[PDB]
Amino acid sequence: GAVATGEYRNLFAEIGKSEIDIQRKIDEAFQHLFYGDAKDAAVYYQAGGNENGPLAYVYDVNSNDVRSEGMSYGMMITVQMDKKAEFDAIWNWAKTYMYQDSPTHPAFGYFAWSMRRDGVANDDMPAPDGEEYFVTALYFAAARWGNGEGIFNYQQEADTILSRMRHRQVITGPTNRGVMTATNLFHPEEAQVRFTPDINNADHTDASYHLPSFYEIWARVAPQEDRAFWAKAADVSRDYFAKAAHPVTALTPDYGNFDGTPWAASWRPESVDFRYDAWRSVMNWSMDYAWWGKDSGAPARSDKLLAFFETQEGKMNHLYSLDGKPLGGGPTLGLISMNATAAMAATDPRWHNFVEKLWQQQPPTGQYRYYDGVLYLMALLHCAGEYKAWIPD
Ligand code: NA
């Protein structure tokens, strides 16, 4: 695995791109998304400052709301790119405005998934993959930059936040969506991340939230009492992908049950199909394989997914039934980007075409640029060999 060798694959270089052009590709994506035209290109907004220094956020320019996932991806992008100032700015806004610190609030320990730009939460419940990226990005920040104090003691923040994700108790109380009751963020027996800690729908999961590549970091650096749990979670997720991905196409559903079957949410019964969440599943298992080499099924699964998408050339949708029936939409940058990351595990040389397809893209503009853009930039960093495990002491 790349973590053991320290050798991360530069998939763009393997398909013949020069390092100067690769660096320019990443630099342009970053510059557009972080510092581009405010109305058409950027998803990053500099939001003044407080006692911790500058504040900033990544936001969904469509809904005009700050999303915890985007904040956490922003932090991951910025630590990977050695952009401490931007990382610290994003973290400051997340921890200041999004994180619930009241021990009697049902969202205690969690970051609000959807928040208005004035700091008013739309929903105090978390999108758990946000928490997962926050913690991991914080450990990586500790490793790259060392720990500061207060909110910038990155390692202490990660440790506390991660411990609470596991050990959170059931709490009931008022929220911006009315009185709610919520629980921990990982099932204590199944060792799987929940789709939601809201007690009314807590016993479900989402394949795109399974991040064994990160659980392996936590198994090494978390509070000692929880390391065996995170190691279990890593193993569980590898089996989960094996069960949850369709055996022919390797498409996963947006939401799922702990046993691997698709789950139809009452408010979104189309969650049983391959849609916006499920685009990311392949990145998760491919990253895990590339880093750790433990998921012996990941190469075949990546190969299956790429073989499926090769059948869609010139008619690619972005919504699919798990057996591969198109359910609408056209190609999206986000899905192109995630498919390219399958090349971190794929063996069949058709992966070259998917990495070339990513190379041919450009930074997104317009109303849907947030989700496309954060996925694009993460995909560029993975495919350039620039998305690494930065394991702290
Ligand atoms: Na608690």
Author numbering: 5 to 397
From the paper:
Here, we have studied a potential GH8 xylanase from the shipworm symbiont T. turnerae, the genome sequence of which unveiled a treasure chest of carbohydrate-active enzymes. We have shown that TtGH8 is a single-domain endo-xylanase with six catalytically relevant subsites that hydrolyses X6 to yield predominantly xylotriose. CAZY GH8 enzymes act with inversion of anomeric configuration and thus feature two essential catalytic residues: a base to activate the water for nucleophilic attack and an acid to protonate the leaving group for departure. Intriguingly, TtGH8 shows the highest activity on mixed-linkage β-1,3,β-1,4 xylans, which may reflect a genuine biological adaption to, or at least an accommodation of, these marine substrates.
